[PDB]
Amino acid sequence: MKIWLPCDAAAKACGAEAVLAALRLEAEKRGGALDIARNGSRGMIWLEPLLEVETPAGRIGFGPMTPADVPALFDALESHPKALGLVEEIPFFKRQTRLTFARCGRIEPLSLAQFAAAEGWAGLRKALKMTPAEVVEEVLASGLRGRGGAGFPTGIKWRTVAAAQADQKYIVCNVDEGDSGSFADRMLIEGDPFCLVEGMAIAGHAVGATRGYVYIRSEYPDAIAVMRAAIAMAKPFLAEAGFEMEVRVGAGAYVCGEETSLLNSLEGKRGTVRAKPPLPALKGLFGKPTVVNNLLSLAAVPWIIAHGAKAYESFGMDRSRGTIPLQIGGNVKRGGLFETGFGITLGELVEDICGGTASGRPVKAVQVGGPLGAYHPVSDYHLPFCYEQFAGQGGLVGHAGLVVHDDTADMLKLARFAMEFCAIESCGTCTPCRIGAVRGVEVIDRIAAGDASAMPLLDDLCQTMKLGSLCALGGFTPYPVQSAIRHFPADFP
Amino acid sequence: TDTARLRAILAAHRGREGALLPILHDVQAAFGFIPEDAYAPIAADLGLTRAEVAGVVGFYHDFRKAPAGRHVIKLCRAEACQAMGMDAVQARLESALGLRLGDSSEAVTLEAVYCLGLCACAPAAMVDDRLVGRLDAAAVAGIVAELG
Numbered sequence: 001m002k003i004w005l006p007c008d009a010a011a012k013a014c015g016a017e018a019v020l021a022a023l024r025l026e027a028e029k030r031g032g033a034l035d036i037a038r039n040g041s042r043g044m045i046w047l048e049p050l051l052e053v054e055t056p057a058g059r060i061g062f063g064p065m066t067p068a069d070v071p072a073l074f075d076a077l078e079s080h081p082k083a084l085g086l087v088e089e090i091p092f093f094k095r096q097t098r099l100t101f102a103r104c105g106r107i108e109p110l111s112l113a114q115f116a117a118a119e120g121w122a123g124l125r126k127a128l129k130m131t132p133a134e135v136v137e138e139v140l141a142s143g144l145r146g147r148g149g150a151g152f153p154t155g156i157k158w159r160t161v162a163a164a165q166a167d168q169k170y171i172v173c174n175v176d177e178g179d180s181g182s183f184a185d186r187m188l189i190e191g192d193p194f195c196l197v198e199g200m201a202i203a204g205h206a207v208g209a210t211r212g213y214v215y216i217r218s219e220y221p222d223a224i225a226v227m228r229a230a231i232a233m234a235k236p237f238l239a240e241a242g243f244e245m246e247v248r249v250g251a252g253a254y255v256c257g258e259e260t261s262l263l264n265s266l267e268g269k270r271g272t273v274r275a276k277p278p279l280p281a282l283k284g285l286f287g288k289p290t291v292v293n294n295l296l297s298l299a300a301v302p303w304i305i306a307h308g309a310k311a312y313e314s315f316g317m318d319r320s321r322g323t324i325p326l327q328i329g330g331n332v333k334r335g336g337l338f339e340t341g342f343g344i345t346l347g348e349l350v351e352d353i354c355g356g357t358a359s360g361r362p363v364k365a366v367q368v369g370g371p372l373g374a375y376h377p378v379s380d381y382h383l384p385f386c387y388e389q390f391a392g393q394g395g396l397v398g399h400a401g402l403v404v405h406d407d408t409a410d411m412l413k414l415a416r417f418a419m420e421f422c423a424i425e426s427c428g429t430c431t432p433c434r435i436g437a438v439r440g441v442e443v444i445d446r447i448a449a450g451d452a453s454a455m456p457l458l459d460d461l462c463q464t465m466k467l468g469s470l471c472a473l474g475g476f477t478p479y480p481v482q483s484a485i486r487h488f489p490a491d492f493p
Numbered sequence: 494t495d496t497a498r499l500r501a502i503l504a505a506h507r508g509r510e511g512a513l514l515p516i517l518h519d520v521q522a523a524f525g526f527i528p529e530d531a532y533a534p535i536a537a538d539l540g541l542t543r544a545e546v547a548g549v550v551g552f553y554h555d556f557r558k559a560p561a562g563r564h565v566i567k568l569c570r571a572e573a574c575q576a577m578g579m580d581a582v583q584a585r586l587e588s589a590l591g592l593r594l595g596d597s598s599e600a601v602t603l604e605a606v607y608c609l610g611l612c613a614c615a616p617a618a619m620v621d622d623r624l625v626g627r628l629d630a631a632a633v634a635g636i637v638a639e640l641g
């Protein structure tokens with residue numbers, strides 16, 4: 001029988017390798033077909049080592065398959081302890097719209113056949129027939145905006161880059177998700193990699209670029225190789241587009257996720273954030289215009305242009321339009337990924353969909369965004385997921401990161417970790433992060449001691465950090481602190 | 494056979510755009526660190542100065558300034574992995590090896606990485622190019638068993 005054993009890090013980490021080994025062993029001991037596949041992750045990590053088996057009805061999924069439970073197979077798939085039935089029919093997978101991550105976990109990632117059979121290469125082969133302006137207007141009609149920031153319409157960005165003359169423009173994908181809880185990019189590039197290739201090719205054909213780049217971290221060693229193999233395999237499919245893309249590995253810096261620092265690291269220099277009289281769009285990589293975007297933004301481009309922009313605008317609230325993946329990690333029963341339209345309350349996402357906590361305890365904190373995001377408690381369960389409303393209710397929603405902490409968590413430790421992070425992760429260009437962070441890390445310890453001349457001091461520090469810092473690594477660092485302080489005062493003496 | 498390797502590496506990355514970072518990656522991958530005896534040739538072949546080649550090496554954490562132990566253990570310290578008890582894993586493991594966070598040795602090197610993508614699998618570690626998740630207080634036993 002056909003076997004689908006994930007090749008993702010979320011599976012390899014949980015021991016998918018041992019599952020493979022045990023399966024092959026038992027098959028050698030018990031004569032059988034033994035057809036193994038190496039798909040990606042479906043987006044449900046609480047059972048990531050799921051051994052989907054083919055059947056006339058569909059594909060029946062299994063739980064977190066430990067090699068000790070492998071012997072249970074080849075006997076009866078119905079009387080198995082870890083039975084899930086149709087993996088597609090799980091209420092955690094059913095409720096997802098799942099557009100961008102549609103063909104992620106149900107195909108071999110580096111298989112061109114399965115990709116093409118899945119409506120792949122449609123966006124690209126459809127765009128080349130169109131013009132550089134028609135594509136841009138398509139993109140703009142949908143108001144996709146920005147997925148790694150406050151949200152800037154990518155249509156306007158592409159327009160600005162297009163209306164700028166130079167012998168050689170550029171395009172960059174900023175997949176450097178050093179934020180915590182954010183693992184969507186990793187999945188999308190380790191599963192369905194050709195989507196990124198396609199989106200970048202489309203974007204390059206649109207803007208007017210011929211050379212392209214993709215910036216991967218070093219903490220994602222599997223994704224790098226996957227993307228390399230994808231680029232090397234799709235060279236033929238890239239030729240038709242007039243587009244040569246190369247992977248560039250980061251070197252261990254969270255601040256290299258900023259557009260300026262990113263393209264500064266691409267240039268061979270050290271990733272110090274630049275000032276912003278000129279925008280990277282006007283003057284970027286090697287002084288030439290460059291369109292720098294996130295992966296999730298360059299993963300919807302093909303879908304947007306092919307399936308119709310009017311469709312992608314249907315999903316979402318009044319201002320925010322389209323589907324977003326919500327990554328759910330930390331202390332939580334059913335973690336993983338939930339792709340859906342905006343307007344959903346995190347109450348539903350955290351109390352109903354993903355149950356509660358793994359420990360079984362209640363939740364005291366829910367941190368949207370990375371460590372640059374406020375600590376939203378249970379009381380904010382009546383707050384739907386959209387950029388405008390969250391940015392209005394003293395917070396931030398970026399790459400849709402979402403962790404969870406139970407009652408056995410100390411907010412002091414976390415508020416200290418925030419500044420510790422802002423300190424260890426800092427280029428050192430402007431003072432409010434150089435000194436501000438390493439002084440706030442002391443002020444928090446002082447607060448822990450019991451001093452009263454620290455809290456107002458801390459407030460002033462946070463305010464000057466907000467209003468003075470050059471980038472958001474030291475302009476949003478105050479948010480965790482202030483949130484942990486104003487939401488959980490029973491932990492801060 | 495250092496000059497040879499370095500020259501080969503530099504020849505492999507000849508003509509690229511912003512080729513300092515890749516060249517440094519390859520150098521580190523070859524030896525294990527960026528030797529001060531290789532700040533000059535890189536600078537020369539790229540047209541830079543020793544100063545810039547040193548600044549780039551200093552800014553980035555992935556570029557070792559001195560070698561690590563036979564084994565390496567990276568252990569996230571971010572929010573999610575912290576949530577599901579990374580501190581306990583850290584304590585257990587550093588008691589097992591006897592090396593605190595950041596404290597290196599000739600045997601091992603315990604350090605932080607601050608994410609691996611294994612956020613759902615909150616407790617996450619990287620042991621010698623092998624990722625591990627759901628690191629309970631029992632998995633550490635096997636972590637150290639295969640890791641002398």
Ligand SMILES: Cc1cc2nc3c(=O)[nH]c(=O)nc-3n(C[C@H](O)[C@H](O)[C@H](O)COP(=O)(O)O)c2cc1C
Pocket residue numbers: 145146147148149152154174175176177178179254255256257258259292293294295297298471472473
């Ligand atoms: C400290 C810091 C880290 C960032 N990290 C990322 C990241 O990992 N991924 C990302 O897409 N954008 C990141 N950004 C946002 C970039 O500045 C830029 O907005 C992004 O590359 C464009 O993505 P869009 O297509 O959603 O506009 C980061 C910004 C800052 C200040």
Ligand code: SF4
Pocket residue numbers: 255273425426427428429430431432433434469470471472473474475
């Ligand atoms: S806030 Fe910190 S990381 Fe950001 S530009 Fe200033 S010094 Fe650099």
Ligand code: FES
Pocket residue numbers: 179180181182569570571572573574575607608609610611612613615617
């Ligand atoms: S936060 Fe440690 S796994 Fe991503």
